[model samples]
Target chain A: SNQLTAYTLRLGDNCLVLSQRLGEWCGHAPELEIDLALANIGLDLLGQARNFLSYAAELAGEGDEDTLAFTRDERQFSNLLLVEQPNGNFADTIARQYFIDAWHVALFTRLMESRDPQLAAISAKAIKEARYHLRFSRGWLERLGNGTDVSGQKMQQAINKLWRFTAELFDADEIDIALSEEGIAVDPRTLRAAWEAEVFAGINEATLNVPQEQAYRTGGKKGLHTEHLGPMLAEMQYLQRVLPGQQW
Target chain B: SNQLTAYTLRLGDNCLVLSQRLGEWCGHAPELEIDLALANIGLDLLGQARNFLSYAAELAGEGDEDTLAFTRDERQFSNLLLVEQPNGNFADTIARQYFIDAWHVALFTRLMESRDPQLAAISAKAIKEARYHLRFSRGWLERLGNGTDVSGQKMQQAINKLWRFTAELFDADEIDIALSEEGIAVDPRTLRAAWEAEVFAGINEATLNVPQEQAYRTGGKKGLHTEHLGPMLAEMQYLQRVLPGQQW
Candidate 1:
């Protein structure tokens, strides 16, 4: 059960980190409808994280969802490196969502059969949602990639830059070993082949060239996130940390 | 032929005037996603206007889209009241869009069956886009209506203020009557019941009250718009009117 705590932290941390990234699009999206749509997706991810983390917290004898989310330190987070990167522009945002959502759909599809009851249930529900998110981002990627010359070139550039972080998504470490043994966790390394296949398929369909593989970036799972997380944490945790236990 | 030119101007005027109104949300939307979405809607409307106006110019054998769009007087415009209302806040914008998009969807659906090939083509293409706009606005309406007390109250206030303008969407003036008789348009009046039913369903589902008809307004269809149109036209016509025949 002690290892279960670490496994749960991994899942919760991934959700928390990605949710934070999506939340960045809240008021800054290029269009009103897309703004709401992205924010809605972010909130949905946060809600999913809340559920997973709450169960994880209960299993770990932690306080609750709020405690896990608000009290966690940067070093304890386990989100992938790609998600922690700052949202640059519309193209960058779409590229990030496309890459992450594709990987998530493939991962969650397999995790639907997880041996752990809560994990399986969460994965089953999340897989359906992730499928939709993947479709949306894929549609957008195609539109941008095949759009006007400027948009197409920008999309290509975004894909090239963001591809470096994709490898870190499937990199497993000590946490992977502990959770994999219990049949409650997925090894990102195990998911890599399918992830790459799906991502490449999406790229091909979108008429976008798959970026050449580059050096892998890691450390988020090890609690060493990018520089972006610090500022994000400051903004997110400001009120909660400032007024401890305060209720509206 | 001259009459057709005027008719085209009417359609273009509707779209152009409304697009000008929606453009006001560019940077001021409450959230980033909303900003992008509204801007996209504005741009879409503008594009639609350009297509219609350009087609009209071809039919008239007179001038280009720019000349027709910019040379028009304020008294010549023909947009319905729903789109001309100011974008007050997030709630107001959503409320306004909800009403106008519903009407547009219905109108476009009928227009898709028009006898005029060009009009039918535009209608068919735009109906699909309008469906998304309706979905976006309706979703927001439900969220704000069913959300917190503050949001719900603001949504109610928005409904009250914008409801009076909804009647103008269905008012069939001489121009609309002529177009409908030519088998190239749907009588706006014919769409009223369907629009009302859909709007009512959305409002009810969102847990929001439909404002009762107290002092319904009209005259936009009769080329008698509110004072808002004058200032809006001043800006819209400035560039094109000042630099006649200029093209990039």
Candidate 2:
């Protein structure tokens, strides 16, 4: 049950953080269409987050989704370090999105086969959404990578800067080991080859080099996020905290 | 008592918001020396903020500097619209600092002679720091305004962009009317002549024009802020919210 709770939080946190990050691009994107596109994407992730958090709340036998969503501190969150990153330039957001969408596609595809029927059903539904997200990110990946020389360089630089964060996506731990043994979870380690295969082919199609640096970063699953999350959480949580169950 | 509490908050809010804005340049400045300089200025404002906010808290009968600074919602804050403006380019920060410093120099010098001893003491000490702040901003104002065609153009552009916010610094509402009637606070409106003389002279020295645009902006004191302040406050207040009741 504890492992299931952890697994649910991991999924919920990724969606929640990414939603918050994308929501920030609203009204500030390079174009009006881009702004709307980002907001829609953020809305999609928030939907996924609500689903996961609701399920996790039921499993815990206490707390509703709203309380869990707004109340948790940074150390208590279990999101990927990738999603908490600032949406720096448009290219940076594209790069971060591409990396996470690629990982989600791989993980959710496998999660669809979990022994737990409810988990399998959620994964089955989410995998389709993840595929659409992957398509959106991949489209941008090629557009920027093969656009102007200047854009290509910016895209590559964003990719290189974000490369260090990709390692933790496949860093399986005791929870994965325990659940995978029961056929209730994907062993995160087993998803790495699939993630790389999809990612590398896209990068090649975009004419961008594969990042050569070894992956040395990890720890968001254990709740040690980069400096970005605290501010993100603060801004995200401030309205909720200020009113203390305030909604209008 | 309500008037005094609001008065104290108006002063504290300006310091805190401007300090937060300057602190943003800490690592992102054009030069390392610039990074140190902006942080030092931010620290100076933060110190004064502590003094003013502490007094406000004492008047309110609950909370402290930490609670007031970190927990207040946007509508609750009464900072000048000038202080809450976003920090843009280096020229933008320079224009913002120079404008506020000149105003501070004028206001604090008069405030040092207030009927209230606490306000008197805080202003006497702060006027010296305000002089130092003015010097730094004034030196840069000349460098950017008179140095070269590109710098001069950028300086003028920054000034024009920021000109709308200047009027509210000296716009007196009922709070000012009430306090000025008691001789306990300077009527912010009365400081404009002093502010313009100093500011206009500096602009002439820098070989730049006083921005031709008439100032029309206001409402920060009534809690209406630009879109910039929300995200900034999110970043600034994140840690304190993440760990509510947290101390240094």
Candidate 3:
């Protein structure tokens, strides 16, 4: 039962955290159309986050969606490190989104078949948005990678910089293992092949080389994280922290 | 007549730009209390900016406050170079706020005596807020400067990094010259002495040294600016630019 809540939180946290990062692009996208697209994707993830968090809150029998999202500190968040990576440049953002969007499709596809009825229903709904997000991010990845010498180099650099964090996306822990055994969660390990197949195909089409093997960073699921998440949380949680139940 | 409108824009632009910078601190301040304080000050400056920009819009006889603020490009924005600098660290934010708050108190105090009735009214209301702003920033300056070894070093570094931009704050241009001669604007040059007196006294009390003479950077009034302003405008103007004439 505890494993179910933890597994649910992992899904919600990944969406919530990534949604916050994408918001940084709201007014700063390369062009108007791109700005709107990024914001739209962010809103989609925010909606997904709300649904998953609300379920988690109900299962946990404690705080609601806002409580889990706004009240949690950095150390308590269990998002994959890939989603929390900095949106360094346009290339960086595209690479980060492309990686995660690809993973979400793989995970959510199988998640829709889970024995857990509510989880299956949420995944059924989320998979549609996840597919659209992948199209948008993958389109950018290919365009930027194959576009020009400078653009190609940046895309490559961003992909290379972010490659290490991908390991955690499929790094199943005890909770993942326990929940998956009970058919309540998708076994994350099973999703790696599908994720890599999609991502590698996209990378090849983009003309970007796959980064070679390197030691992977993996702590976000365990509540250990990169230096970036703290400041992001500080900014995201500030209003709620200060105002405490402020309404629009 | 053109000079008066342009001069009014300078006042509004300084407040507007700096307020935008301060808003970046909303959730990222060092403490919860400090977070609220920074946001409060940003709101104060935003109010002052609206008053000045509204009057400028009336004088220009073409646009309203929203039109002027949301439609203009970076090259058209005429604010002090100092006000648009980035919020680097807490110390950096305090240093930037301290310098501008000192200048605002000086500028608005004399601006209260302007022959332009609307300008005088804006100044009278703004001076009260400016005084409180100075108190907040100056208090932080002293606390951070004298607090600890690391904080003191950071505060000193921040002050030095930002010192080069101060020269533009007092450098009067043709509009300032013409409007001040006609009693419609406070000559920016005349505010320098009082600014220096207040700033230097605060620096002494804070156990910090005044940075030595250096070549000053100018051209913000002429629409030339540091690279920082462009990104700021892109973010600030995005919503309005994307959805033209959007209303709440």
Candidate 4:
């Protein structure tokens, strides 16, 4: 149950932070279709977040999903470090989305087969959504990476800068090991080979070089994050903080 | 009582928001001295904010500075529109600081002579800080505006972009008329001429043109701000929101 709760929080935090990041691109994207598409993807992530957080809260047996989300401080959040990165330029945001969405599809597809029916059910639903998110981001990755010289350069820079963060997505910790033994979770490390194979093909098709950097950063799952997360949480959680117990 | 609270909140909000904006330049500035200068100015503004907000709380006869600063909704903040404008480029940040520092120096200099000893005392203390702030910002203004072709051009663009928000700095409402009647506050309008003299001299020395747009934007004093303030406050007030009633 403890492992399940932590596992659920990892999923929910990824959805929540990425959803909030995509929501920022609302009204500011290059086109109306892009704007609507960003919001739609964000909408789906928020839905996924709702499901995972509710399950987490149910396991904890105290707070509801809303309580867990709107009340928790930064140190307590267990989201991946990648999702919390600042959306730099349009290409940068797209690169981030492209990376996470591909991994989501891969992770969720495997999770859909977990022995725990509840986990399997949630994953079954989420993996479908993640597939579409991957398609959307991947298409843009190709378009921008192969576009004009300026765009191509920007996209390459985005990919190289973001490469360091991709390591933790498949970095297995003790919780993953424990849960895999109980058939309640898949070992995160197993997701890497498949993720890399898919990512490399996508980058090659887009004429972008796969980042060869050896740099690695991990800690989001352990409650440590880059400087960006605190500010992001502060903005996301402010309304609830000021007017406690008030409905939106 | 509401008007007085509104009036004092206006002063506090300006300092708070500008302080937060300047704090963003920490570690990102071009030079170490620039970093220290911004943090130092931000520190001074925060001090002024604490003073003004505490006095505001005292007048309301409930809530302390902490409550007032962290609890109020965005609609309740009464800052100037110009201060809340995003620091676009470094030159943009310089332009913003230049405008506000000039206005603060003028406004607070007159305010030091207010009949209300409480306000008079606060302004006397703050005016000295504002003077230093103006000198620091104006020094950069001249440096950037008189530098290379790229620097001169960027600084002018920054000045012009920020010009539209300047009118609201001197725009007053019933709050000013009421407070000015008994010498509790300086009429914002009265300070404009002095502000222009200082600003014009600085602009000429820096080799920049006075922005010609009769453009105007306001409403911050009415608790309406540009899109920037809510996000900024969320980040600024996040720690306080998360761990309510806790001190660092």
Candidate 5:
């Protein structure tokens, strides 16, 4: 039960942290349409976070989605370091999105086949959103990666800077393996091949170089994180902290 | 009683909000000494905020300093618009600090004479800190303002940008008038002449022109704020929001 709850919590944290990052660009994005698109995608991720967090709460027989999202400290958060990296620039944001979107499309597509009916149902709904997210991020990835000299350089730089964090997306640990064996969660390692195939195709199309493999940063699964997550959580959880039971 | 609480809350809010702004420069200041200086000043302001907020809570007969500081929403906060403005650059931060420090020194000096013993004691303690703060800001004002042409230009620009918000410092309202009538609060209007004399002298010594008197912006005393306050509160209030009563 703890393993399953941890797995579910990790899933929720990933979406919640990434959603928080995307929300940072709400009014500040390059263009009106792009701002709306990022926010829409962020809303989609937020919805997914709520669903997963609610399920985790139920499994643990404690708290609710709001408490789980708003009350946890950074050391208790298990979001991927990839999601919590600062939204450096538009190219950086798009690169982060492209990687996560591709991975989500792969993971949710497989998770839809889970033996747990609720998990399967949630993934069945989320896979559709993930597919559209991939399309949007991929479109921007290509547009920026292949556009002007400066844009292309920035796109590649973002990719390179973010690449090391991607290794943990496939590095399955005990909780992942346990949940996978119980037929409740997809084995993260199994999703990597398809994620890579799609991601490589997009990068190649974008005229961007695939970064050379390097030492991978990990441990967000165990609650360790980069310095960025604390500040992000502070912003995300402020309202709920100050006005605990505030209505409207 | 409510009016006194409101007045006290405004004083605490001013210190608290500006302290948060200075904290933003904690590790990011131009030099190590400046970083330490900013953090020290921020700590001083935070202490003052705690003092005033605790008194407000006492006067209101409910909650405590933590609750008042952590739980209030933007509409409830009454920090000055001058303090809430973003720390634009080094020069901008210095300009904002100079203006506010001058006001604090003037305000607290007279506030120490309040008929309310608690208010008088708090102001007496705070005034010494304000004097030191003014010296620091005044010193930096002259250095940056009298430095290279570009530094001088940026310093002047910062002063001009922040000047409009200064009018609210002395604009006495019903609360201020009532408090002044009771001899429980300093008449803010009475402090303006001293503030202007000291501020003008510093500006002149720094080789910077005093900005032209312009249209004034007010309303922070009545809970109206610029857009910046909400985000600032979100970050400042996050820990308390998430954990509620998590003890160290």
Candidate 6:
């Protein structure tokens, strides 16, 4: 029971965290059309989170998706650290999306063949949307990275700041171990080489620096997250917590 | 020869004027998503104006699109009144768009069948975009009208204030007549009934009342616009007029 619950939460939390991050760019994107594109992507991620968290709730024999998403405290959520970082600028936002979306696309592509029917179905639908999100973010990343001197410098700086958090994405922890044993989740650590190669190639093409190998951060899978997640949760859950059972 | 030039200026001026008005909503829209949508639409219209003005320049055997756009006097420009009105609020902006986009959709739809090859080609492309703009405005109009008491009241106020200016869009003048005689233009008066029908249907669906017909304001087609046009032209043309013939 806990295996299915934990597996689904991992998927849901991944999407929810990214959705929250991307939603921060709702009105502040560099271009208007890009704003729409990012919002659309954010909506898609939120939708995927809804599906996964709902299933996770069913497996846990607890409340529904709304309760799972809104009622949970910071320690109960399992999402990568990179997705919770503040979207400081267009460059930082795109850099974060580029890094995360690339990995999501790779991971989702493998997850489509998962043994668990629910996980595979979720991955199948999400991977299609993820592909478009990846393309959109990658295109912007390329533009910002290789554009004028100013944009290139900013993009490189964004990459340097965000790169450390990416290591946790591929870190195989208890959740990965459990899911991998059940044949429901691809061991993310196994996909590290391909993700790194593709991302490095993309960065190189964009004329942005591939950040140097350094000590990477972790702990999201272990119920620990960065300082960013707490505020994000506060903002996200404020309305739900304030107006319990309020319906539109 | 100058006939084509004048015709092109009419088209370019319409887009330019509307683009200028919409650009005012760049950061000031009531809603953030709507702000981006308005800015995106403005950019699209600006692009259209640039293309048409460039063509007009070629026809006039004179300067480029920038020159035509930025060097022209207020009296020389020919845009409809609906576009130049100040954006009072969200409802006012939507009402303005609802009226103008309907007129533009009709104009572009007919222009697609024009005898002028260049005009026809541009109309073909523009009509597709105009269709989307119309849909966007119409959807918002319906939402605001049907949603809340405040929004419905605001929508009514916007419609009443902007309704009189709608007549100017259908008032064909001597310049329009000349172009119509040459088979280079579609008469605006011909599209009036269709535009009215569409607007009526949209308002009806939104359960909003249409204001009683009032005395029509007319002048934009005659190269006469409101006081806003003067300031808009001054700001838009300042750089180009200041640095005449300067190239980037």
Best candidate per TM-score, number? Answer: 2
Say which prediction, candidate 1 or candidate 2, comes out ahead on TM-score.
Answer: 2
Error of 2 at A235 (Å): 0.8
Write down the lDDT of every candidate, Cα atoms only.
0.79, 0.89, 0.89, 0.89, 0.90, 0.83
In order, the candidates keep a fraction of the true contacts of: 0.00, 0.73, 0.00, 0.87, 0.93, 0.00
After superposing candidate 2 on the true structure, give the runs of residues whose Cα lies further than 4 Å from its correct spot: A245-248, B59-63, B238-248
Candidate 3: misplaced stretches above 4 Å?
Answer: A1-84, A87-191, A194-248
Off by over 4 Å in 4: B1-5
Identify the candidate with maximal lDDT: 5
Question: How much DockQ does model 3 earn?
Answer: 0.04
Candidate 4 local lDDT, residue A228: 89
- RMSD for each model, in Å, please? 21.6, 2.2, 13.2, 2.2, 3.1, 22.8
Q: Candidate 2 docking: what grade?
A: medium
Ranking by TM-score: 2, 4, 5, 3, 6, 1
Q: Candidate 4: DockQ?
A: 0.77
* C-alpha positional error of residue B114 in candidate 1 after TM-score superposition, expressed in Å: 81
Over 4 Å off in model 1, which ranges?
Answer: B1-248
Give one digit per residue, the lDDT tens place, for model 6 in A1-248: 68768878877998898898888677777679988998999999999999999899888887988888877778888887888888898888888888888888998899999998888999999999989988988898889888999999999999999988988878886767888888878888898887888798999999977878683898786679987787677667755654556674
Higher-ranked by TM-score: 2 or 5: 2
| TM-scores for every predicted model | 0.49, 0.94, 0.58, 0.93, 0.88, 0.50
Show what share of the native A-B interface contacts model 4 retains: 0.87
Worst 10 residues of 2 chain B by lDDT: B238-247
How far off is residue B149 in model 3, in Å? 1.0
Give a tens-digit lDDT track for model 2, residues A1-248. 99998898789889999998898787888888778778877888888888889889989998877888888888889998899888899999999999999998998888989998878888888888888889889999999999999999999999999999899988999998999999999998898899999999999999999999997789999999899887777777877776666665
lDDT of 4: 0.89
**Model 3 chain B: lowest-lDDT 10 consecutive positions:** B234-243
Q: In model 3 chain A, where is the ten-residue run with the lowest total lDDT?
A: A237-246
Query: Across the candidates, what are chain A's individual TM-scores?
Result: 0.93, 0.97, 0.97, 0.98, 0.96, 0.96
